[PDB]
Design an enzyme around this catalytic site. Structure first.
Site, PDB file in Angstrom:
ATOM      1  N   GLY A   3      26.531  -2.172  13.365  1.00 52.09           N
ATOM      2  CA  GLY A   3      26.313  -0.883  12.749  1.00 52.09           C
ATOM      3  C   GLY A   3      27.302  -0.577  11.639  1.00 52.09           C
ATOM      4  N   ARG A   4      28.232   0.334  11.948  1.00 54.13           N
ATOM      5  CA  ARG A   4      29.132   0.856  10.920  1.00 54.13           C
ATOM      6  C   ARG A   4      29.896  -0.245  10.219  1.00 54.13           C
ATOM      7  NH1 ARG A   4      28.564   6.451  10.735  1.00 54.13           N
ATOM      8  NH2 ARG A   4      27.728   7.139  12.755  1.00 54.13           N
ATOM      9  N   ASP A  61      14.953   1.327  19.022  1.00 53.09           N
ATOM     10  CA  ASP A  61      15.956   1.475  20.073  1.00 53.09           C
ATOM     11  C   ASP A  61      15.927   2.929  20.540  1.00 53.09           C
ATOM     12  OD1 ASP A  61      18.229   1.606  21.679  1.00 53.09           O
ATOM     13  OD2 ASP A  61      19.608   1.664  19.958  1.00 53.09           O
ATOM     14  N   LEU A  62      14.913   3.257  21.334  1.00 54.62           N
ATOM     15  CA  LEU A  62      14.799   4.605  21.863  1.00 54.62           C
ATOM     16  C   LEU A  62      15.119   4.685  23.350  1.00 54.62           C
ATOM     17  CD1 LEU A  62      11.533   5.765  19.998  1.00 54.62           C
ATOM     18  CD2 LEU A  62      13.954   6.041  19.273  1.00 54.62           C
ATOM     19  N   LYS A  63      15.404   3.558  23.990  1.00 55.53           N
ATOM     20  CA  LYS A  63      15.860   3.510  25.374  1.00 55.53           C
ATOM     21  C   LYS A  63      14.979   4.377  26.272  1.00 55.53           C
ATOM     22  CE  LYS A  63      20.676   2.482  24.104  1.00 55.53           C
ATOM     23  NZ  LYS A  63      20.570   2.764  22.665  1.00 55.53           N
ATOM     24  N   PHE A  64      13.678   4.080  26.245  1.00 55.52           N
ATOM     25  CA  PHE A  64      12.720   4.851  27.029  1.00 55.52           C
ATOM     26  C   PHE A  64      13.119   4.890  28.506  1.00 55.52           C
ATOM     27  CE2 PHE A  64       9.420   3.277  23.805  1.00 55.52           C
ATOM     28  CZ  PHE A  64       9.498   4.412  23.060  1.00 55.52           C
ATOM     29  N   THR A  79       4.304   7.306  31.687  1.00 49.52           N
ATOM     30  CA  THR A  79       4.769   7.813  30.396  1.00 49.52           C
ATOM     31  C   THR A  79       5.501   6.736  29.603  1.00 49.52           C
ATOM     32  OG1 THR A  79       4.915  10.063  31.177  1.00 49.52           O
ATOM     33  CG2 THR A  79       6.277   9.467  29.266  1.00 49.52           C
ATOM     34  N   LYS A 110      17.654  -1.817  13.026  1.00 46.60           N
ATOM     35  CA  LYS A 110      17.496  -1.045  14.252  1.00 46.60           C
ATOM     36  C   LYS A 110      17.352   0.435  13.904  1.00 46.60           C
ATOM     37  CE  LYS A 110      20.948  -0.005  17.123  1.00 46.60           C
ATOM     38  NZ  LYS A 110      20.795   1.402  17.501  1.00 46.60           N
ATOM     39  N   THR A 148      27.093   0.561  26.913  1.00 40.97           N
ATOM     40  CA  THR A 148      28.394   0.003  26.547  1.00 40.97           C
ATOM     41  C   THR A 148      29.528   1.011  26.709  1.00 40.97           C
ATOM     42  OG1 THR A 148      27.163  -1.247  24.916  1.00 40.97           O
ATOM     43  CG2 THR A 148      29.490  -1.344  24.766  1.00 40.97           C
ATOM     44  N   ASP A 155      22.066   4.233  11.329  1.00 38.82           N
ATOM     45  CA  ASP A 155      22.464   5.481  11.968  1.00 38.82           C
ATOM     46  C   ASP A 155      22.872   6.511  10.930  1.00 38.82           C
ATOM     47  OD1 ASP A 155      21.938   4.464  14.542  1.00 38.82           O
ATOM     48  OD2 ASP A 155      24.016   3.796  14.784  1.00 38.82           O
ATOM     49  N   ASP A 163      11.597   7.188  31.644  1.00 38.78           N
ATOM     50  CA  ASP A 163      10.694   8.226  32.115  1.00 38.78           C
ATOM     51  C   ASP A 163       9.907   7.654  33.287  1.00 38.78           C
ATOM     52  OD1 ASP A 163       9.062  10.672  32.206  1.00 38.78           O
ATOM     53  OD2 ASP A 163       9.461  10.892  30.042  1.00 38.78           O
ATOM     54  N   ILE A 164       8.948   8.426  33.779  1.00 39.02           N
ATOM     55  CA  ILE A 164       8.059   7.913  34.828  1.00 39.02           C
ATOM     56  C   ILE A 164       7.253   6.727  34.306  1.00 39.02           C
ATOM     57  CG2 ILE A 164       7.943  10.175  35.923  1.00 39.02           C
ATOM     58  CD1 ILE A 164       5.324  10.735  34.663  1.00 39.02           C
ATOM     59  N   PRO A 165       6.787   5.847  35.195  1.00 40.25           N
ATOM     60  CA  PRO A 165       6.129   4.606  34.732  1.00 40.25           C
ATOM     61  C   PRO A 165       5.007   4.832  33.741  1.00 40.25           C
ATOM     62  CG  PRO A 165       6.692   4.418  37.073  1.00 40.25           C
ATOM     63  CD  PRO A 165       7.057   5.834  36.645  1.00 40.25           C
TER      64      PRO A 165
END
Ligand SMILES: [Mg+2]
Ligand SMILES: [Mg+2]
Ligand SMILES: [Mg+2]
Ligand SMILES: [Mg+2]
Lengths: 218, 218
Positions: free
Chosen positions: B198-199, B61-64, B70, B34, B121, B12, B66-68
């Protein structure tokens, strides 16, 4: 441009995409970069469009924890985009964090727009998720939350624009997702209209846009 | 060259040089990486390629959400990029998750692990209430995780606090990824398959030694 038109670039190849963009003119429309194109080409593609004079709607529908969504929106502002969107389903704290991340950018801040309900969602899709309101009603609820959080507007179909301008006011921007003509949708209260294949599959994209724009207030 | 570690270190950074300075210190035998919304918005898929060239497996890790169709095309784009794991929002609904599953079938065993975010989270009950969701975070997450399993996806992002519950309810093969009060060792004991950190690693004084101390306990 003063045109309310935003042309959707839904190409799966950088060659075709910029061949179309070469044909048209940034004085006539803005451009939308969505998830597939960005996943394939990244922010360099956005820089390509900016170098060609266009303003860009970055349509990635960020939906994450508040701090990550804020950093992503700030990243998009650093890219120089004109508009970026988030999911109102991310909640009020996420939308607020995104708004606060853009404050220092001042008049360079992109417009910050929320997705409410995706056009694909029907009541049966929502009930799987614990949502018992109709798509339109859940969308109205999330749109009110978006306005309360101080965002610039929502993605909203032309069919709901009269209801949403009435409930949420004139300044709150309505962007369509991409049947009304463009002039009818503008009368309904749409502020920016996303248009895809009618323009990108036109044999004369410049003349298609000229006739669309000639019908619209600027 | 595949790691036996369950650790996935979150990149990050807002700067490529800082990220790659970190990536050069560590080694792909000791963790996966990640790439999230911030670095992908800054650098795009070439950054994933740069990590692959250094031998790392990557969680995109883009947490898509959208519509199915896409989301399916974005997931297929990630598969063509060759990533190890990719995620979607279970909140996109069953048809969206099914579309994403189907998009990976032509990629077969090279397909990334397809993992759903259930509840973020960051979310507390009060954040969910604004959205009309009346369950606790944990119980809404359990509902969405059951839906994810029913749609045939490979696992979910879930806290270590819920791992024993989820392994009991959803089975051993259903993968649990923690997003980063339970130690890595306890999390592993509870059934967590992969742990994002992460950090605590990337911002530590000596990231290599920090990662080693974590792996030593696993
Ligand atoms: Mg601007
Ligand atoms: Mg080295
Ligand atoms: Mg090394
Ligand atoms: Mg693999």
């Amino acid at each position: 441009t003063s045109s309310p038109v935003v042309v959707a670039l839904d190409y799966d190849n950088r060659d075709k995409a910029l061949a179309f963009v070469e044909r048209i003119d940034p004085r006539d429309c803005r451009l939308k970069v969505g998830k597939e194109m960005f996943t394939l080409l990244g922010p360099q593609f956005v820089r390509d469009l900016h170098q060609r004079g266009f303003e860009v709607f970055l349509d990635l529908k960020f939906h994450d924890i508040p701090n990550t969504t804020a950093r992503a929106v700030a990243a998009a502002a650093e890219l120089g985009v004109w508009m970026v969107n988030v999911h109102a389903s991310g909640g009020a704290r996420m939308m607020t964090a995104a708004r606060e991340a853009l404050l220092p950018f001042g008049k360079e801040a992109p417009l910050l727009i929320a997705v409410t309900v995706l056009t694909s969602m029907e009541a049966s899709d929502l009930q799987d998720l614990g949502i018992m309101l109709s798509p339109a009603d859940h969308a109205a609820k999330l749109a009110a939350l978006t306005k309360r959080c101080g965002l610039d507007g929502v993605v909203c179909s032309a069919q709901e624009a009269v209801r949403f301008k009435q409930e949420l006011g004139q300044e709150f921007k309505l962007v369509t997702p991409g049947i009304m003509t463009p002039e009818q949708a503008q009368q309904a209260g749409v502020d920016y209209m996303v248009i895809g294949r009618p323009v990108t599959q036109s044999a004369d994209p410049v003349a298609t846009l000229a006739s669309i724009n000639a019908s619209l207030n600027k």
